[PDB]
């Protein structure tokens, strides 16, 4: 692991230091359909005229990005995506910009979000929750090793691929930090309490959110949920968790370790790092290299009805991407 990690750090820094830029123009792509919406822009299925290959394009509006104060997280997103490479992370293929928007084009993962299936199927059995969880304990072990912190793990961001495996997408709050950061960002359910208490936080938030993930996945609902964000953060912070009776002792001991309010005692934040996780009773069946190798057989597999099938994605309402004749936020975005 450490060996691979080492070789993997050098490539990171090589693309980290001289990032790629304006790799494609819009003209080459065909707008087919919106696959998702978000807080600062949208993702749509696109087809590359020249190669007849399909991609997801994440359009970002430069002025909406400056209004919501997202200027520095958009460049961290572009810069970690062009620089990373792991099996469970989507690949950014082309990035370019224009008078009105910023674009990231990356592989289309047809399977739909884990979210659609988790809410449809209702909940996952522990075998299946564990299948996905392994992929995140490793993705994080890699991300983290590169001094990256991904700060937005949730259903809605793990896309399921043709072989039933994960693809973490949206690196819109990833940050490379040795040491602490203080931004309030995330999705309210997933926020570790340190973030809502403004204490200055670190990599460990990613382990509290993985503990939130395995709960939602195996139970059908988040461990703290309410109508108002406010009422959610009130519950997070108290950190009194109740578990469903169908949870194995082991899984309840794992969650008990991950949704731990005291960073000092939080799994993943301790002395053996991520090995306290990889070795905990629950993951004893887990052949970690087989996982990595993408040769564990997938639990669930979506039916892709051929090329460019969007049926595993909800229907959104199309807005026209339109570009102004006057360059919009010029200076701010000069390094995208």
């Amino acid at each position: 692991v450490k060996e691979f990690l080492a070789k993997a750090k050098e490539d990171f820094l090589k693309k980290w230091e001289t990032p790629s830029q304006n790799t494609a123009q819009l003209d080459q792509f065909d707008r087919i359909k919106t696959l998702g919406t978000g807080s600062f822009g949208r993702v749509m299925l696109v087809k590359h005229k020249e190669s007849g290959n399909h991609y997801a394009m994440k359009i970002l509006d430069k002025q909406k990005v400056v209004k919501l104060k997202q200027i520095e997280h958009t460049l961290n997103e572009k810069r970690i995506l062009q620089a990373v490479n792991f099996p469970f992370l989507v690949k950014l293929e082309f990035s370019f910009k224009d008078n009105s928007n910023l674009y990231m084009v990356m592989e289309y993962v047809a399977g739909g979000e884990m979210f659609s299936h988790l809410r449809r199927i209702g909940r996952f059995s522990e075998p299946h929750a564990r299948f996905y969880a392994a992929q995140i304990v490793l993705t994080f072990e890699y991300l983290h090793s590169l001094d990256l912190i991904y700060r937005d793990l949730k259903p809605e961001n793990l896309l399921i691929d043709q072989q039933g495996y994960i693809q973490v997408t949206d690196f819109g709050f990833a940050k490379r930090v040795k040491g602490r950061t203080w931004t309030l960002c995330g999705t309210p359910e997933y926020l570790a309490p340190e973030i809502i208490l403004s204490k200055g936080y670190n990599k460990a938030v990613d382990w509290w959110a993985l503990g939130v993930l395995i709960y939602e996945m195996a139970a059908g609902y988040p461990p703290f949920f309410a109508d108002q964000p406010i009422q959610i953060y009130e519950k997070i912070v108290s950190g009194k968790v109740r578990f469903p009776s169908h949870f194995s002792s082991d899984l309840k001991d794992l969650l008990r370790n991950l949704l731990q309010v005291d960073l000092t005692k939080r799994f993943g934040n301790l002395k053996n790092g991520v090995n306290d996780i990889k070795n905990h009773k629950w993951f004893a069946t887990t052949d970690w290299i087989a996982i990595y190798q993408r040769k564990v057989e997938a639990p669930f597999i979506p039916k892709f009805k051929g090329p460019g099938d969007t049926s595993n994605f909800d229907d959104y309402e199309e807005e026209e991407i339109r570009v102004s004749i006057n360059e919009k936020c010029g200076k701010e975005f000069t390094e995208f």
Partner: peptide, 20 residues
């Protein structure tokens, strides 16, 4: 049941990020 409570709760959809 808790599952019941979650379902009638208004956060069953795609939860958005809080920027601030």
């Amino acid at each position: 049941t808790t599952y019941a409570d979650f379902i009638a709760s208004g956060r069953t959809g795609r939860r958005n990020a809080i920027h601030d």
